[PDB]
Design a binder for this molecule. Structure first.
Ligand SMILES: *[C@@H]1O[C@H](CO)[C@@H](O)[C@H](O)[C@H]1NC(C)=O
Ligand SMILES: *[C@@H]1O[C@H](CO)[C@@H](O)[C@H](O)[C@H]1NC(C)=O
Length: 195
């Protein structure tokens, strides 16, 4: 389930997803859709200056680091009752999960988290808590920021680990990957940033 977290229940820390924006949008809109962080923190997480306007563009298909508060429940780490998603006229949990949130969650996880779904029957304008995966676990005794990462096509665990200043075996043990060569596009990795 989601990302694992083994520290005391109620533990709060800072995590992130590397978000792939389905459409052209702006930092201001992301701040709004997510509501998990303030604008200046979003800008800093993506290495942009103080004077940057909220209208700063994010191109379709490009990535944005989105920070949020993680809460651990004893088993798992989830974004802490945020972000909130309002169901649309022709939305389905699976389409929301996959087409809005990069499949960082499954429709089952969206189901369990909002208690009301036991099957997928939902109403428009209803608010859903989206439990983005996270953790506050340390990495071999050190403090890390956990980043949810969706594997790109043609990527390997070596280059992914290196890009995040992490050891490949760390990436592999943390994500219980027996065989690196089996890495799939769109597989969600828990990357423990040394930071
Ligand atoms: C960019 O995103 C649009 C959807 O908004 C999609 O139709 C197109 O395939 C994407 N292009 C690339 C280069 O991924
Ligand atoms: C991993 O990906 C990078 C970048 O495309 C490539 O240069 C590197 O050689 C790859 N390693 C393997 C094992 O494929």
């Amino acid at each position: 389930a989601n990302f694992t977290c083994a520290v005391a229940s109620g533990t709060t820390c800072k995590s992130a997803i590397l978000y792939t924006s389905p459409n052209a949008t702006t930092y201001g809109n992301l701040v709004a859709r997510f509501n998990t962080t303030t604008l200046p923190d979003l800008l800093g997480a993506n290495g942009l200056p103080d004077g940057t306007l909220s209208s700063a563009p994010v191109a379709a298909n490009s990535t944005v680091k989105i920070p949020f508060r993680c809460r651990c429940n004893g088993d798992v780490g989830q974004s802490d009752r945020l972000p909130i998603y309002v169901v649309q006229p022709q939305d389905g949990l699976d389409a929301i999960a996959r087409n809005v949130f990069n499949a960082f969650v499954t429709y089952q996880e969206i189901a369990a988290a909002n208690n009301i779904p036991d099957p997928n029957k939902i109403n428009v304008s209803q608010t859903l808590w989206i439990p983005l995966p996270c953790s506050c676990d340390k990495e071999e005794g050190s403090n890390v920021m956990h980043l949810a990462y969706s594997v790109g096509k043609g990527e390997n665990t070596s280059a992914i680990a290196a890009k995040y200043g992490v050891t490949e075996s760390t990436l592999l043990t943390r994500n219980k990957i027996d065989d690196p060569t089996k890495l799939q596009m769109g597989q969600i990795l828990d990357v423990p940033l040394p930071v």
